[PDB]
Amino acid sequence: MEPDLFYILGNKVRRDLLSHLTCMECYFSLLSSKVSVSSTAVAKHLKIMEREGVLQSYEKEERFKKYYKISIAKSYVFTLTPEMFWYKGLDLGDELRDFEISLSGLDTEPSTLKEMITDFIKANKELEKVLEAFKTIESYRSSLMRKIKEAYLKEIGDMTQLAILHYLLLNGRATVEELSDRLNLKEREVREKISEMARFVPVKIINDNTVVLDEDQILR
Amino acid sequence: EPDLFYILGNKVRRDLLSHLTCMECYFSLLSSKVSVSSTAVAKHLKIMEREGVLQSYEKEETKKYYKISIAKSYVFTLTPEMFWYKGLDLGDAELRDFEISLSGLDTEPSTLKEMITDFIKANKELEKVLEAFKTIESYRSSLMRKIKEAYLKEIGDMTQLAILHYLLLNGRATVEELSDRLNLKEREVREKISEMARFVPVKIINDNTVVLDEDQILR
């Protein structure tokens, strides 16, 4: 009945692997240069992920490697405070919709237990809408990312420019040093890749070392 | 800094944490169906303290209890095309409506330019979702605090409170599931539900599944 994504994602070598296995075309190795770890410690991890049904292996065979694929498409949500702990997984797949999350005029000062319970359940209903909108946006983004990966490949051809784009689209911010680390390239090459890439994608550098997508130029 | 995946990736740590979220409500930190040494339990608690999820306190007259040191919500995604996560700090909720404009977002873009434009559009709606997520969770957390205090002074029956707490966060529970969580017999659990029924609209469906009567609570 389930893969424990928490346990999988709890080790940082597995995170790194997954963040490389996610842009398969884009990287030479599945590991960042600094995450220095042996095999079969890396192989230990891959096997752990195969066993959990997270990853699937292939032999890429010809006439006269192991590869891996990600077996799941899921979004997760969780909360930890002193008053509550809960989590929920969401199956991605689909339906564009104009959600409204109606938080204004949820009661802020209930007098009685009866009121508070009513108020809690009304909040639960707006929470459902949040989760539904989160499910929708993530199904959309994942579909689109696959298109972006193919469109960058054909339209431009550079694995490693795509790798950078991929990261920024998912995370917004990246230092030259962090990109250098995960790409196992030197800082000098990363910076030139960014300038080569700026010819196709509005990309700029801020504070001398921080790579960000130019969102002003992308919308208008 | 604290690695919640690592914390949450163990079954006892989860069981421990869900008991620690209603600390007055339970007489023990563990469910009945789980047999773990005591000394593993003390190890798990220590791991959570090192990570900065827990803070422990000492009492004299020597007893040790535990408090949760974080108030955070999290989001993550894994598909063949992406893996990312985001921790959200909870606190002073500012209530206000959010509109997530998702049509059209375009299901058929032609150029990389369009696709990139489309992705940043989608990212802007995502930022509204995560903020709304942050808002309802601050709200729900504050309200649980109040509900626990209200239940304490107004009616006083811990275990009745654990059941409500459970039911508010999760849709429903079986008598067996509750029995496991509370370390009680199913009979005692059924007794607590009907006692509670006078203060909280709670229906029992199909002889075993306990749910909050939403039609009665809302209308």
On whether the A2-72 domain is CATH 3.90.550.10, my answer is no
Count of CB atoms situated within 10 Å of the CB of A91? 11
Smallest Cβ–Cβ distance between A78 and the set B74, B96, B97 belongs to B74
Count of CB atoms situated within 10 Å of the CB of A7? 17
Note which residues in 122-181 of chain B have CB less than 8 A from chain A. Answer: 122-123, 125-126, 129, 132-133, 135-137, 139-141, 143-148, 150-151, 154-155, 164-165, 168-170
Q: Is B210 exposed, middle or buried (0-12, 13-18, 19+ CB in 10 A)?
A: buried
Q: Which two tokens stand for residue A145?
A: 């990312």
Is B78 in the A-facing interface, judged by CB distances under 8 Å? yes
Smallest Cβ–Cβ distance between B100 and the set A98, A118, A152 belongs to A98
Smallest Cβ–Cβ distance between A72 and the set B78, B123, B165 belongs to B78
What's the rounded Cα separation, in Å, for the pair A50 and B39? Answer: 31
Residues 6+ apart with CB under 8 A from A121: B168, B212, B214, B217, B218
What's the rounded Cα separation, in Å, for the pair A188 and A93? Answer: 40
Residues 6+ apart with CB under 8 A from B148: A83, B22, B24, B25, B161, B165
CATH code of B1-70, in short, is: 1.10.10.10
Q: Determine which of A4, A18, A79, A149 to mutate to test the interface with B (most B C-beta atoms within 10 Å).
A: A79
Is the Cβ–Cβ distance between B97 and A128 less than 8 Å? Answer: no
The domain defined by B157-219 folds into Arc Repressor Mutant, subunit A (1.10.10)
What's the rounded Cα separation, in Å, for the pair A151 and B210? Answer: 52
CB contact under 8 A, B78 and A18: yes
Smallest Cβ–Cβ distance between B120 and the set A104, A119, A219 belongs to A219
- The greatest distance separating any two alpha carbons of chain B, rounded to the nearest whole angstrom, comes to 74
Identify all chain A residues contacting B73, using CB atoms and an 8 Å cutoff: 77-80
Q: B170 phi and psi, to 5 degrees?
A: -115, 155
Q: After which residues is chain A broken (C to N over 2.5 A)?
A: 64, 94
Identify all chain B residues contacting A163, using CB atoms and an 8 Å cutoff: none
- The greatest distance separating any two alpha carbons of chain A, rounded to the nearest whole angstrom, comes to 79
The Cα-based distances of A24 to A27, A156, A201, B81, B204 in angstroms read 6, 17, 21, 9, 51
Query: What is the β-pairing status of strands B98-100 and B209-212?
Result: unpaired
Is the Cβ–Cβ distance between A164 and A27 less than 8 Å? Answer: no
Question: Any idea which residue has 């919709």 for tokens?
Answer: A97
Is the Cβ–Cβ distance between B170 and A88 less than 8 Å? Answer: no
H helices of chain A, in order, are: 5-9, 12-21, 41-51, 113-155, 159-171, 176-182, 187-197, 215-219
CATH of A73-157, one of 1.10.10.10, 6.10.250.2960, 3.40.720.10, 3.40.50.920: 6.10.250.2960
What's the rounded Cα separation, in Å, for the pair A153 and A149? Answer: 6
CA atoms within 13 A on the CB side of A19: 24
Question: For residue B116, which of A22, A64, A149, A63 has the smallest C-alpha distance?
Answer: A149
Query: In angstroms, what is the resolution?
Result: 2.5
Give the H/E segment covering residue B86: strand B82-89
Identify all chain A residues contacting B129, using CB atoms and an 8 Å cutoff: 101, 130, 133-134, 137
Task: Name the residue type at position A121.
Answer: I
CB contact under 8 A, B133 and A76: no
CA atoms within 13 A on the CB side of A174: 27
Report how many helices (DSSP H) and strands (DSSP E) chain B contains, helices first: 8, 8
Residues 6+ apart with CB under 8 A from A220: none
What's the rounded Cα separation, in Å, for the pair A18 and A182? Answer: 12
Method used experimentally? X-ray
* Three-class DSSP category at B77: strand
Is B116 in the A-facing interface, judged by CB distances under 8 Å? yes
CATH code of A158-220, in short, is: 1.10.10.10
What's the rounded Cα separation, in Å, for the pair B77 and A73? Answer: 8
Domain spans of chain A?
A: 2-72, 73-157, 158-220
Closest-approach residue (CA) in chain B for A171: B84
Identify all chain B residues contacting A54, using CB atoms and an 8 Å cutoff: 78
Question: For residue A84, which of B166, B38, B194 has the smallest C-alpha distance?
Answer: B166
The Cα-based distances of A96 to A56, B17, B116, B204 in angstroms read 30, 36, 18, 36
Q: Which two tokens stand for residue A29?
A: 């190795």
Q: Is A41 exposed, middle or buried (0-12, 13-18, 19+ CB in 10 A)?
A: exposed
Give the H/E segment covering residue B151: helix B112-154
Q: A190 phi and psi, to 5 degrees?
A: -55, -50
Q: Exposure pattern of B163-174 as b/e (b: 16+ CB <10 Å)? A: bbbbbbbeeebe
Question: For residue A142, which of B122, B110, B60, B153 has the smallest C-alpha distance?
Answer: B122
CA torsion through residues B121, B86, A121, B91, sign:
negative
Contacts 24+ apart (CB under 8 A), A167-171: A168/A203, A168/A211, A168/A212, A168/A213, A169/A145, A169/A213, A169/B116, A169/B119, A169/B120, A169/B123, A170/B82, A170/B83, A170/B84, A171/B84
* Chain-centroid distance, C-alpha B115: 37
Question: For residue A171, which of A69, A42, A22, A6 has the smallest C-alpha distance?
Answer: A22
What's the rounded Cα separation, in Å, for the pair B89 and A164? Answer: 27
What's the rounded Cα separation, in Å, for the pair B132 and B126? Answer: 10
What's the rounded Cα separation, in Å, for the pair B85 and B88? Answer: 10
Closest-approach residue (CA) in chain A for B115: A148
Q: Which two tokens stand for residue B193?
A: 């539900």
Domain pair A2-72 / A73-157, same fold: no
The Cα-based distances of B94 to A140, A152, B124 in angstroms read 28, 41, 19
Give the H/E segment covering residue B68: strand B63-68
CATH of B71-156, one of 6.10.250.2960, 1.10.260.40, 3.60.15.10, 2.70.98.10: 6.10.250.2960
* Three-class DSSP category at A218: helix
Is the Cβ–Cβ distance between A80 and B53 less than 8 Å? Answer: yes
Q: Is A112 exposed, middle or buried (0-12, 13-18, 19+ CB in 10 A)?
A: exposed
Give the H/E segment covering residue B63: strand B63-68
Q: What is the dihedral of CA B180, B181, B183, B186, to 10 degrees?
A: -50
CB-defined contacts A:B, below 8 A = 282
CA atoms within 13 A on the CB side of A192: 6
